[PDB]
Each structure stands twice: as C-alpha cells, then as structure tokens.
Ligand binder design. Structure first.
Ligand SMILES: CC1(C)CC(=O)C2=C(C1)OC1=C(C(=O)CC(C)(C)C1)C2c1ccc(-c2cccc(Cl)c2)o1
Ligand SMILES: CC(C)CCC[C@@H](C)[C@H]1CC[C@H]2[C@@H]3CC=C4C[C@@H](O)CC[C@]4(C)[C@H]3CC[C@]12C
Ligand SMILES: CC(C)CCC[C@@H](C)[C@H]1CC[C@H]2[C@@H]3CC=C4C[C@@H](O)CC[C@]4(C)[C@H]3CC[C@]12C
Lengths: 227, 9, 333, 286, 55
C-alpha cells in the first residue's frame, strides 16, 4: 500500500526475497533422506561409511540412484543420549551396526559385561524409544567372516545358555538375528531390515536404498491420504 | 451429460 | 577417608539452610492481592521455519529477535512488521541454542557440532558471514549468552561452562564442577555472575571474574532444562523434568517457592520473567505455556496455540512475549 | 409416478452433491490450507462437481416442461458449464489416479513431481484443455424453436447439411476422450499401484498392516467401480441411440434420464470417496 | 582419591558463606515486584495506542 514509505517497501521486498530463498531451500532439503547412524565403535562402523561413500556430529552426503542421503554419525558424543536424541525425531531411517564377532568379547571396563549384551541393550533402548516409534531400523551384522572363523573355536552358549542349536555358522547367525529382532516391542508400525554385511561394492548401499524406498513409499501413501 | 442433445419426444 | 568429612560438611550446610528458614514465602505473601486471570492473544505469528524451533532470543531494542531452527536457519525477525531482516544458513543444522548480542551486531549459535559460531551482521560487504568459531567443547553446545561484543559464555553437555574471548578464539575461563550435562545458562543483569542448570538436578552460581563456583542449589528430582535470572539479580527460577519450577535465592542460599500442579506431568523447556518479575512464564511439553504468579504460586494464565511442544520462550527487555515451538511457528503475545 | 420419482431422484442427487461439494470447498478454503498436491486436486474436483451439479435443475425442468423456457444466453452458458465441468471433473479424477500411481510406483521421481506448484500447473493445464470444449459449447450452443412441434429446444447447433455427421462425431469424440482414455488410465495406474504395494515389506509385515493394505485395495476398487457404474450406462445409451438405432418411448426416455441421473451421481459421490475417506482429511476435520 | 579431596575443598568453600533469613529475602522479592508493578506491560494490559503490536 501507499502507507509504507520508501524504505519500508524496500524492507518488505527484502523480506519477500528472503522468504523465496527459504522456501527454495526447504524444497531442496525435504528432498533428501536422513539416516541416523548408531552403533558402537568396536562394532565396526567407519568401514560401512567408507564402503558407502565409495567434532560432535559427522555428516556424510552421498548420492545413489538419483537420491541424496545425509548420514549423521553421533558416535563422538560423550554425554547423555536422552538430551539430544529427540533432534532426530523426523529422521528417515536409523542404521544400527553390530559386530557378530563380538559375541564373546568382554567390554574394556573392569566389569565382566559381554559386548554383545551391551549392543543388545543399546538396540533395545533405541528401538523402544518414544521418538522412534515409527522409524525403520536397518540392522547391519558386520564381521561375518571373523564370526564364521571364530564360531568354530568358541561355542555360542558362552553368551547365553538359551542357545541349544549346533555350532554351525548359519544357525547361530539366524539365532542372533531373531534375538535382535525380538527386542522390537512395536512390531506393527516399525519394520527392521536385518542384513549381514557383504563387503562388496553396491551391496550395503543397495539394501539401504531399498529400505529407504519402502519408507518413502509409506510417506507418500500417508501424504496422499491413502494410508 | 446427454441432457442437451437433440432428442425426439 | 575424607568422604565422612564431606558428609559432615553437607550436614552443616543443610543445618545452616534449615536455620535460616525462619519463615515461608507463602506466609509472607498472603498480604498481597492476586494477579488475576492473564489473558493475551497471538498478536504476531512469525512463519517461515520449515523445521522444529529450538531457541530464540530477543534483541536489546525490544524489536528484533533471532530464531534458530533444525533445518539450519537463523532467522532475524522484525517483530513489529513480521519481516525477515536476515536468514543466515548454518553449516550444521543441529542447533540447540542461539543468542543476540547486546549491541545488535553479532549473533551466536551452536549445537551438536560442539562449536559456537559467531556471525557478524554489520559487515561492510552487506551479507552476514561467519566471523568466529569457538571449537573448544567436547560436548554439544546447550546455551550461549553474550557478556559483551568480545566475550561470550557458553554451556556444554560435557558438564562444563566456558567464558571465551571472541577476537582471539580461545576460552579464557573454564567452569567445572557439574556432574551432569549443563542444559541452561543465565547471565546476571550486571554481567558479573551467572547461573547454570545441569542434568544433575542442581544449579550452580559462577563468578565471571574469579572463575569458580560460589553456591550450589538442589531440590529437583530430575534434569534441569531451563534457568533464568530474576530482574533484580538476586534470585533465579529453574524448570525441570519433574513438571515443577523452583525459585532459588542467592542471598538466602535456599529454595523459596515451588510452582507445580497436580495435572501437570510434563517437563519444562523454558522459563522467563516479566519486566517487573511478577509473572513467571514457562514453556511446557503439553503444547502450552503457563504464566505463574511469582509470589503466590498460582497458575495465573495459560498461553495455548502451538500444535507441538513449546521449546523456547523469551520476554522482551521493555516487557512488551515470544514463544517458539516444534510446530515451526513463532508466536508473539 | 415415474416422473415424480424421477424428479425426486434428480432433486436428491442435486441436493446431496451440492451440499457435499460446498462442504468440501469450505473445508479446503479455510480449515485446511492448500499446501499439498492432494488438497489442490480435491479442491478442483469439488469445484468441478459443484458446477456440474448446478446444471441439474435445468435438465429436470426440461424433462418436466418438455421445453426450454429460459433465454438463449442462459442455455449457452448452462451447456458450456455442463461440458466444461464434466471434462474438468473426469480429468481431475484421472490426474489424481496418476498422481497416486507416481507416488507409489515411482517414489524417487515423486519427490520431483508432487510439488504443490506442479499440482497447480497440472490443474491450470487441465482447465485450459477443457476450455476447448467450453468454447466450442459457447460458440455452437444455443436454443432453436421447432414450428411443427412448437417446442423450443436447447442444444448444440451445427450446419443442417451434415448435422447428423457432426453430432455423431462430437458424441464419439466426447465418449472416447471422457470414458475410454480415463478409464484405461485409472485401471492401469491403480492396478500397478496395488501390484507394487503387494511387494512392499511394510504392508505385509503384520496382520494389522495387511488389514491396512486390504483397506487401501477396497478403497481403490470402490473408486473404480463407482466411476464405471456411474459413467458407462449413459455413454452406452448415447452411443446406441446415435449409431445403433433410433427410437422414442416413454420407458426409453425414463431410462435415459435415469442414466443422466447416475452420471450426475458420480459427481455427487466424488466428495464422499475422495474427501470424506482420506485419512489426512479426517484428521484435519477433527 | 583426588576427586574426594576436591569435593571436600569445594564443600568447605561453600559452607563458609554468609546467609540471611528467608523472611528478608521474601520481603525484598515482594518489594521489587511492587515497586515496578506499573512498568510491566504483561502485568497490566497496555492500551492499543501505546502497544506497538497493533492489529
Ligand atoms: C469461456 C471459457 C474460455 C470457456 C468455458 O467454457 C469456461 C471458462 C472460460 O472458464 C471456466 C468455466 C467454468 O465452468 C467455471 C469457471 C469460471 C471456474 C472456469 C467455463 C465457463 C463458461 C461460462 C462460465 C460462467 C459464466 C457465468 C457464471 C459462471 Cl459461475 C460461469 O464458465
Ligand atoms: C472393475 C472392472 C470394471 C474391471 C476389472 C479390473 C480388475 C478386477 C482386473 C483388470 C485387470 C486385472 C489384472 C490383469 C493381469 C494380472 C496379472 C496376473 O499375473 C495377476 C492378476 C492381474 C494383476 C489382474 C488382477 C485383476 C485386474 C486388475
Ligand atoms: C457396470 C456397467 C458395465 C453396467 C453397464 C450397463 C449398460 C450396458 C446398460 C444399462 C442400461 C442399458 C440400456 C437401458 C435401456 C435400453 C433401451 C432398449 O430399447 C435398448 C437397450 C438400452 C439402450 C440399454 C442398453 C444397455 C444399458 C446401457
């Protein structure tokens, strides 16, 4: 209107330009897929990042099949996870990495606590969290070769007496997968995509892409009102 | 549709 | 060996605290009339954030304000005309705090990047560029406030606070003693002391000049998320996850009044005072803000209108109220 | 009797369609801002359905009085509204089907296609495409008086040397571009969407999610069946009378007007199928 | 060991402090609120003439 002075109109024009830039940036940002990379450092997590690519948060951007993934690693935090875990509420997916070879390894602390049990309790606390009720989790069971070479020497029953199967690799791996998946209290809205690592080009990335595609399909279904 | 076509009646 | 000595010191401290409690604030305040029902509306609705708001801060001129969002935006709003003066992009979208300099020249931000970024607004080039970065904390940056144009005090999730020197880039003072992640920070009106609330359910009063803790306040049963100084500089209010606010006094060295309600079970994210200190505003997780009577502990008013959790709450210097919520909207009452 | 029940059916369809379309338009205008593509599509569909339903009382009056008592300009604008909004409603249905197919079967491209700006562009293109038939109905539509019967009839006027050929060609073109293409597109898109959803790990994971998939399939089948049942009879009747054989009976006239009533019932029921069944719309209303 | 000694020293420093009665603190807190009660736009609604956030 004519009420605004010469500088007021310039200020309004600047605000409109800023708003246009903001909406363009938001359109670009909402077109990208967020992956919260959790797990343990001893489990082997940097190797997965190196495979996929080819001081508190490490952000990795990579493009696969015309889809932009931003993976956020929060393994450098040494504080309470509760106070900042809600920042990733709208994350597209979680990637949880655990090492199968660490079934009998003890923690670095003086307490006799199994590393596999600590990984299981971390997965239980993350999956059964009020912020990730409908967030899909991709489970990466790493170091399958080392686990296969180690299972022939040490039985799996040392971890827990519940296991009664043979000491073969396939049965033990399936039992570990089912034990991890049984921690998912909310089996209705959340799906866990378990996948043993392949250590081969375009294998883990393809699995993550498939899970992300399923999540995007569900999001589009909700957006259309069909779901 | 069809209510505005040349009908015989 | 010396643990018994520490226990005896704690017993002496609590006995001295009990001795000084010769009366009750509620008993003394019975002679003042109630504030009444506070009714106010969202006279301004700032829109333009496409993610959850985590922090906002008013400027010293009571007109401009700064807001930080999870999409990596520091937006400077002119509250009178709803215009956007600046929209600073952030190198890290995970921002949990923001600050406005008392001179109106600089804006601070920080978060999970463990870095306090200082941006200059009065550059000759005409665009807001990064002026300084303070990467000295090993935990996430939870709060930051400007003492001056060259000094800024920050609190981190590594149970420490730090007074920095902006022109140099290195911290000049380190405040340690908390056993939990420091979540809230508040400067005194005279900028000589400050108070910090952490996850250990205790608030510590620190001296800027000396650099060591002077008083410690307990009483909360959960983590302290918010803190704010009383306008006179002698008391301060703390909000916790126990759905309770508490008013502590520095001189009395004990809690004075607890603000809570039976049906309130959600934690407090932000606390603030009015210009006169009569109203204590607090943002809650139940999508609403509560305006308590700071002397009668009565729920004087309710501010509703946010569809998500109210995260940040600020009161302008002249007393003429901004609320930022996870619904990507700012509301000025 | 029949006339009475026929006009009662016409009035019921008119009232239901008008009320539903007005309610949907009012909800979209104020309660739920048009920020998504689906909301824009629903708004355009509701507007087209309401404007088509506005035509119904004139056709009921023509059926009862057996003549057109209104002016030539009113007849022209009514015919143009009918044709234009029928085409707009059908094309909006087709584009909603294509949009949902793209969202499901092409999730990566859906990020670059389901922008509200692109939805507005698609709607503008749809309305401009229907503008051809609208302008044709404005230019050629009119009212003429027949003397040997002393009856004033409102319809599309063509040159009398080849009026029959032009009318048959126009009927064939409308039938093709309003039934054959949209029905095939809807069938293909929804079948591909359902086939893709059968392979989605989320939907088959649990019994409740299988129930949700069954509900989605039921909704899609209901939409397709409603469209087919409402639009096939009138088009088949018109084609049969245009090329098969020519006859005039009271029962034939009553069935013809009932087929027209079903064609309008399609637009009457569209708000129920597309607005009052979307989960986002239900949440916004509550 | 050293942490316990540091805690003991901090408790000794905190214990050797001057404290006042809670009655005086409450009286000063009420006095400040009553002195500035007229300068708080939130406590008393400001007429739209002086309110910069006009409709
Ligand atoms: C002319 C043309 C190029 C072709 C055409 O037939 C239509 C066009 C423009 O615009 C639209 C049409 C509508 O049916 C509705 C609307 C307005 C949203 C878009 C059609 C139309 C024709 C005549 C009226 C009308 C005349 C008077 C009053 C009211 Cl409400 C409508 O509308
Ligand atoms: C509703 C009326 C008008 C039309 C009927 C449409 C439905 C029921 C029909 C039309 C085409 C059909 C599909 C044609 C081909 C195949 C491939 C076959 O390997 C599985 C079944 C499937 C996927 C059919 C499922 C049923 C189907 C979708
Ligand atoms: C579910 C869908 C496919 C149903 C389709 C029904 C169609 C085929 C039916 C419904 C009404 C029918 C018409 C009703 C009345 C007459 C008049 C009669 O003298 C010749 C046949 C004719 C013209 C019929 C042709 C077939 C018709 C159009």
């Amino acid at each position: 209107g004519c009420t605004l002075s010469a500088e007021d109109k310039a200020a309004v024009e600047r605000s409109k330009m800023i708003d246009r830039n903001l909406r363009e940036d938001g359109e670009k940002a909402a077109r990208e897929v967020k992956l919260l990379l959790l797990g343990a450092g001893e489990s082997g997590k940097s190797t997965i990042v190196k495979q996929m690519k080819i001081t508190g948060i490490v952000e990795t951007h990579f493009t696969f099949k015309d889809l932009h993934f931003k993976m956020f690693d929060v393994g450098a935090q040494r504080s309470e996870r509760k106070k900042w875990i809600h920042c990733f509420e709208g994350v597209t997916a979680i990637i949880f990495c655990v090492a199968l070879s660490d079934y009998d390894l003890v923690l670095a602390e003086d307490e006799e606590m199994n590393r596999m049990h600590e990984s299981m309790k971390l997965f239980d606390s993350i999956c059964n969290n009020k912020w990730f009720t409908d967030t899909s989790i991709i489970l990466f069971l790493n170091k399958k070769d080392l686990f296969e070479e180690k299972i022939k020497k040490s039985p799996l029953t040392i971890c827990y007496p519940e296991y009664a199967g043979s000491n073969t690799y396939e049965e033990a791996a399936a039992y570990i997968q089912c034990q991890f998946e049984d921690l998912n209290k909310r089996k209705d809205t959340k799906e866990i995509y378990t996948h043993f690592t392949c250590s081969t080009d375009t294998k883990n990335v393809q699995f993550v892409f498939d899970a992300v595609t399923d999540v995007i399909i569900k999001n589009n279904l909700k957006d259309c009102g069909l779901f | 549709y069809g209510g505005f076509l040349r009908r015989i009646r | 060996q010396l643990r018994q000595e520490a226990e005896q010191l704690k017993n002496q401290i609590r006995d001295a605290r009990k001795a000084c409690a010769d009366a009750t604030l509620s008993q003394i305040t019975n002679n003042i009339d109630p504030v009444g029902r506070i009714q106010m509306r969202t006279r301004r609705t700032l829109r333009g954030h496409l993610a959850k708001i985590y922090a906002m801060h008013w400027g010293t001129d009571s007109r401009l304000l700064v807001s930080a969002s999870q999409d990596g935006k520091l937006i400077i709003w002119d509250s009178y005309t709803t215009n956007k003066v600046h929209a600073i992009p952030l190198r890290s979208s995970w921002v949990m705090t923001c600050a406005y300099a008392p001179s109106g020249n600089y804006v601070a931000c920080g978060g999970l990047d463990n870095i306090c970024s200082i941006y200059n607004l009065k550059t000759r080039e005409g665009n807001v560029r990064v002026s300084r970065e303070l990467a000295g904390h090993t935990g996430y940056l939870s709060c930051c406030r400007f003492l001056d144009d060259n000094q800024i005090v920050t609190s981190s999730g590594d149970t420490t606070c730090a007074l920095w020197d902006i022109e140099t880039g290195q911290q000049t003072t380190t405040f340690t003693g908390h056993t939990g992640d420091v979540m809230s920070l508040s400067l005194a009106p005279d900028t000589r002391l400050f108070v910090s609330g952490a996850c250990d359910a205790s608030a510590k009063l620190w001296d800027v000049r000396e650099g060591m803790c002077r008083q410690t306040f307990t009483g909360h049963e959960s983590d302290i998320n918010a803190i704010c100084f009383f306008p006179n500089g002698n008391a301060f209010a703390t909000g916790s996850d126990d759905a309770t606010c508490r008013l502590f006094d520095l001189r009395a060295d004990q809690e004075l009044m607890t603000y809570s309600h039976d049906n309130i079970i959600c934690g407090i994210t932000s606390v603030s005072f009015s210009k006169s200190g009569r109203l204590l505003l607090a943002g809650y997780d139940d999508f609403n803000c509560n305006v308590w009577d700071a002397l009668k502990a009565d729920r004087a008013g309710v501010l509703a209108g946010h569809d998500n959790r109210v995260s940040c709450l600020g009161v302008t210097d002249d007393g003429m109220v901004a609320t930022g919520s996870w619904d990507s909207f700012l509301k000025i009452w | 009797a029949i006339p009475v029940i026929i006009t009662a059916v016409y009035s019921v369809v008119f009232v239901v369609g008008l009320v539903g379309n007005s309610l949907v338009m009012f909800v979209i205008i104020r309660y739920t801002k048009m920020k998504t593509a689906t909301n824009i599509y629903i708004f355009n569909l509701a507007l087209a359905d309401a404007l088509v339903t506005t035509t119904m009382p004139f056709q009921s009056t023509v059926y009862l009085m057996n003549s057109w008592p209104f002016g030539d300009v009113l007849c022209k604008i009514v015919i143009s509204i009918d044709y234009y909004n029928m085409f707009t409603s059908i094309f909006t249905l087709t584009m909603m089907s294509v949009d949902r197919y793209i969202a499901v079967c092409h999730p990566v491209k859906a990020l670059d296609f389901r922008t509200p700006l692109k939805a507005k562009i698609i709607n503008i293109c749809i309305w401009l495409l229907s503008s051809s038939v609208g302008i044709s109905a404005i230019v050629l539509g009119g009212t003429k008086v027949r003397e040997d019967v002393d009856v004033i009839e409102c319809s599309l006027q063509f040159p009398d040397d080849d009026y029959s050929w032009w009318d048959l060609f126009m009927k064939i073109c409308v039938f093709i571009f309003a039934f054959v293409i949209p029905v095939l597109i809807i069938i293909v898109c929804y079948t591909l969407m359902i086939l893709r959803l059968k392979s989605v790990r989320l939907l088959s994971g649990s019994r409740e999610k299988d129930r949700n998939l069954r509900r989605i399939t039921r909704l899609v089948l209901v939409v397709v069946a409603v469209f087919v049942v409402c639009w096939t009879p009138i088009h088949i009747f018109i084609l049969v009378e245009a090329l098969g054989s020519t006859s005039h009976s009271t029962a034939a006239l009553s069935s013809y007007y009932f087929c027209i009533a079903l064609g309008y019932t399609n637009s009457s029921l569209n708000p129920i199928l597309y607005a009052f069944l979307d989960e986002n719309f239900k949440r916004c209303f509550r | 060991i050293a942490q316990a000694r540091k805690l003991v020293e901090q408790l000794k420093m905190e214990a050797n402090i001057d404290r006042i009665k809670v009655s005086k603190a409450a009286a000063d807190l009420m006095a400040y609120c009553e002195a500035h009660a007229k300068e708080d736009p939130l406590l008393t609604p400001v007429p739209a003439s002086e309110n910069p956030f006009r409709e």
